């Protein structure tokens, strides 16, 4: 079914966007910690 195939693409596209946005937030927290560590050193 085209619709079934279309929907697997959509769902996994949505999921990968959630992962990319989770990586952005992880990157920002890592920047917060590496700045704080540099300051405390």
């Amino acid at each position: 079914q085209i619709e079934w195939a279309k929907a697997r693409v959509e769902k996994l596209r949505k999921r990968n966007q959630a992962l990319k946005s989770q990586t952005s937030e992880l990157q920002r927290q890592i920047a917060e910690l590496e700045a704080s560590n540099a300051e405390l050193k």
Binding site: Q1, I2, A5, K6, R8, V9, L12, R13, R15, N16, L19, K20, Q22, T23, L26, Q27, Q29, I30, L33, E34, S36, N37, L40, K41
Partner: protein, 43 residues
Amino acid sequence: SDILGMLKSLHQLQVENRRLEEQIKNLTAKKERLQLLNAQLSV
């Protein structure tokens, strides 16, 4: 057959999906090490 185009789209998304989960694991592992160093310099 009629779905070869979307099947190939899904295939690339499946490869990218595994790269992103692996990358996240490496970033949370890093964050934990940076969190332990921040605690040692803090307390």
